[PDB]
Each structure stands twice: as C-alpha cells, then as structure tokens.
C-alpha cells in the first residue's frame, strides 16, 4: 500500500 504520510491529492501527470 501507499506511504501513510503521503497525500493522495496530487497531480499524477
């Protein structure tokens, strides 16, 4: 799974 500290609200490009 993703890093818990990461933010899903980002540009994927």
């Amino acid at each position, epitope marked *: *799974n*993703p*890093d818990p*500290n*990461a*933010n*899903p*609200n980002v*540009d994927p490009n």
Partner: antibody
Amino acid sequence: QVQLVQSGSELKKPGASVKVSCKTSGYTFTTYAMNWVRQAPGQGLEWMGWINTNTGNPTYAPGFTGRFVFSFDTSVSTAYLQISSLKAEDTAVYYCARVYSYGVPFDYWGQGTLVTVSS
Amino acid sequence: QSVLTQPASVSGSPGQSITISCTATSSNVGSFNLVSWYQHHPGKAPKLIIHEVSKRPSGASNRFSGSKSGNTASLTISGLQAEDEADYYCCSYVGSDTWVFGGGTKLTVLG
C-alpha cells in the same frame, strides 16, 4: 480551525435534480482531497468517491457512477455534489469529509445534508 | 456485503471493556495497515478515533485503542461509559485511491 459546513435539507421529487454544497475554511483548499459519504436510513456509511482538488479529477465508487457529479469552486473554497435521476432510495444523509493523508482519512467531516426523495 | 466485516451489535455494562472486530474479506486491503475507526453519534458527524490500525488522534480519549491480528482489526473501549453508546465503523484503504467502510457496529451501554 478546520470547518466543513454543508447546505441545508432538501426535499425532492423522483426524477428531479439536487446539488449539495460543502464550504470549507481553516485550511488550504487545494492541498487536500474532498470525499463524499452516504448514509441511508437504518444503514451504514458508504464511501461514494472523492475529488482531487489539485487537478479537478473526480473518482466514483461503483454504485455512484452514472448520475453523480463531484465538483468544486476554488473562488469560494466549496465542493459540490450533484445527483440526477433522483429516486426514493436516494433518501439519505450526504457527508463531505476531508482526507489529510493515506494514514489519516476523513479527519474532518461536514455536519451532513439530508436529501429526501418522495413522490 | 462490505469487504470489512463487523458484528452488527455489541453490548456491555458501564465500567467494562468491549471489543469490536473488523475482518477484511479481500486482498484489496493489501498490507491492511491503513485501518481507521469512527464513532458516530446520531445527528452528528462521524468522528475519527483511530487511524493506521492503532494510532490515536488528539481529542479521542485514551480509553479507545486499536489493534490487529492477521486480517482482523479490533477496536477496544476501556472503562465503558454511557456516552460511548454509538455506532462504530472501521475503514480501510482498498487500493487505487479508494476507501471502504465496514458495516458498522451498534454499541449499547446497559446502564
């Protein structure tokens, strides 16, 4: 203070439209995703999807595809939920909820908006 | 048919401790470490009380704790009090930037 404040109760006929608002304050609106959650009478919470406030892209859960629209207006830091082809079984409380991170989802919630659909 | 299974109801008497289970029924939870819990009183917004299986945010009493064994996450409430009577939901990331809630558990405090 982070605050999500939703619009008031709605009463609609089957086949009508509805648009619910979620006005935010106390944080940078485009840094965090806005999620939507539905609770029908005598049922649990159901995750409906989210809108990416950096790109604008919406993501719908299965079962909320086809007639649901997530949007936002950055000039007033408000997110919106639009529902078409309303039917009686859309009667529910609709919540917006912020996601801070993968580890901390739904840390702040709107107070809910009741939408009643009846003929 | 949620992918996270919770008992429909649990009960306890004031002062006791109770446990609510949340078992994942699918592999889309992956490592199952992005598990959060919510307390929901009627007429009020749900409240985050546990995230990342066991982390307690500021504002949630230290009577609320989360754990995991295998694919079953558990919420434990210590020193049960009348105001704990509410609905409780577990929640998991389920990949591709999607989330799911458990069916919820109604906690009754027999006071």
